[PDB]
Symmetry: C3
Subunit: 170 residues, 3 copies
Amino acid sequence: PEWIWLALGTALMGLGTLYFLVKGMDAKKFYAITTLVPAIAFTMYLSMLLEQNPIYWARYADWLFTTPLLLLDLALLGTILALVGADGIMIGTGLVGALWWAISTAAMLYILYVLFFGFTEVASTFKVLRNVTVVLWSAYPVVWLINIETLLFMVLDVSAKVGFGLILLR
Amino acid sequence: PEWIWLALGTALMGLGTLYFLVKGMDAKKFYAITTLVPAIAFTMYLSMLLEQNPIYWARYADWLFTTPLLLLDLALLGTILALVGADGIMIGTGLVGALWWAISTAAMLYILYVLFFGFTEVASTFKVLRNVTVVLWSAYPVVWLINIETLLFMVLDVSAKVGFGLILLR
Amino acid sequence: PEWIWLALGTALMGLGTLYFLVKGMDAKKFYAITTLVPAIAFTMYLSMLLEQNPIYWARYADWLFTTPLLLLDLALLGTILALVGADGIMIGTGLVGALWWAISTAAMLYILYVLFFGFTEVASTFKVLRNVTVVLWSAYPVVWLINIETLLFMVLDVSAKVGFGLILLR
Ligand SMILES: *C/C=C(C)/C=C/C=C(C)/C=C/C1=C(C)CCCC1(C)C
Ligand SMILES: *C/C=C(C)/C=C/C=C(C)/C=C/C1=C(C)CCCC1(C)C
Ligand SMILES: *C/C=C(C)/C=C/C=C(C)/C=C/C1=C(C)CCCC1(C)C
C-alpha cells in the first residue's frame, strides 16, 4: 500500500538534483547546499522504496541529514548544532517507540522560535521560509501521533524541498 | 540497582541546560557550546535510564558526542579531529569487549598531552581545566578495568560538566 | 584465508601514523590531515583483522571516513559534502547487497570529474594526485563486481595512502 506513493516520490527527488546541478553549471555557496538536499533525499527516498519496524528508520535517517542542511541553508543567508541534537533526539524516540517525543517538540519550537528571532528579495525569502517551514513540519508530530502515513510525508518533503529549492533559483 | 543513581543523574543534567540557556538570554560562542553539553548529556542520560549488553552503549554514544565538544570548548579559547578518532576508537573497544582499550589509553594521553602543550581569568580557566579533565577521565579506564559502575560514572560526568559549565559563567 | 593479507596490512598502517607524527614534531594544516588517515586506517584495519556478512562493513566504515579526508586533503590545497554523500551511498549499497552500486559509480565520476576541473611542486602534487586517485579507486568497483577480495583491497589503501602521505612530506 505505502509503495504506490513512494515510487512517485523517489522519481521527483532525483529530478531536483538534475535540475539544480544543471541550473548551477555568495552565489557559489547556495547551489551546493540546495543541490545536496534533493540528491540526499533521492538516495534515501529510493533506499526506503527498495512490516512496521524496518521502513520507518530510513525516513528518519534521510530526514536527519536534510534537516540541519535545510536549517543551515536558512541560517546561512552553537545555534546550528543545537537543532541537530533535537532532530537526533526525535529519531531516537520514534524508532525507540515502535521498534520521548515530548522533548522533540520542545526542541522543534526552539528551531522555529530561533528562526523567528533570526531573520527579523533575501528578506522576502526568509519571511516566506519561516512560515513555510513551520507549517510544513507541523504534519510530522501531527501525523506521527495521527496509505496515509507514507502519503502525507511524501507530499511534505517534496513540498518542503523541491518548492524550497525553487525559491533559491528565484 | 544501577537505576537509583541514574534517575538522580538525568534530573541534574536537564537543569544545566535550563540554567545556561536562561543565563545566556567571543562571548556569543561559549553559551552555545557550553549549553550543548548538558542538554545532549540530559537526553542521552535519560535515554539510558529509559542485562549487561544494552545499557553500556548509550553512555558511549553520549560520551562520544560530549567529548569533542568539551575538548573543542577547551581548545576554542587536525588537533581537534584526532581526539574524536580516539574516542570513537574507545567506544568500539568497550562495546566490542562485553557485547582494544590499549590504544584508547594511548589516544587519551595524546589529548591530555596536547592540552598541556596547548594552554602553556582565561589562563586561570585552562590551568584548572587541564587538571580537572585529567583526573576526571582517569576514572573511565580505571573504573572500566575495575551499583558502582553506574554510580561513579554518574558523579564524573555531572562533576565534569556541570562544574565545568559553571567555570564559563565565572 | 583473507587474514594472511590483513595482518600484514594493519602493521604498515600504524607505522604511517608513527612516521608522520614523528616527522611532524599552511604547513600546520597538512600534518594533522595526513596523520589522521593512517591512524584511522590502522584502527579500523586492526578492527577488521580482530563468514561473509560481518567482515565487509568495517572496510566500508574506515573507507567512509578516510575518503572525505583524502578528498578534503586534495581540495584543501558544497563541493566537499557532495562527495561524502556518494561514499555514504556506496556503503549503503554493498552492505545492502550481500548482508544500488549504479548510483555510487555516478557519484564517483563526480568526485573524479570535479578533481579534474578543480586543480586545472603543489601543481605537481595535484597533477599526480588526480591520476593516482582515479586508477586507485577503479579497483573498488572493479573488484567489487569481480584470498583476492582482501588481497587487492589491502594493496590499494596502503598504496593509496602511505604513498599519498609520502607526497606531502615531499
Ligand atoms: C526533507 C525532510 C526534512 C527536511 C524533515 C524534517 C523532520 C522533522 C523535524 C521530524 C520531527 C519528529 C518528531 C517531532 C519526533 C517523533 C515524531 C517525528 C519523528 C515526526
Ligand atoms: C560528559 C562525558 C564525557 C565528557 C566522557 C568522556 C570519556 C572518555 C574519554 C572514555 C574513555 C574509555 C576508554 C579509555 C576505552 C575503554 C574504556 C572507556 C570506555 C572508559
Ligand atoms: C583509505 C581508503 C579509501 C581512501 C577508500 C575509498 C573507497 C571508495 C570510493 C569505494 C567505493 C565502492 C562503490 C563504487 C559501491 C559498491 C562498490 C564499492 C563499495 C567498492
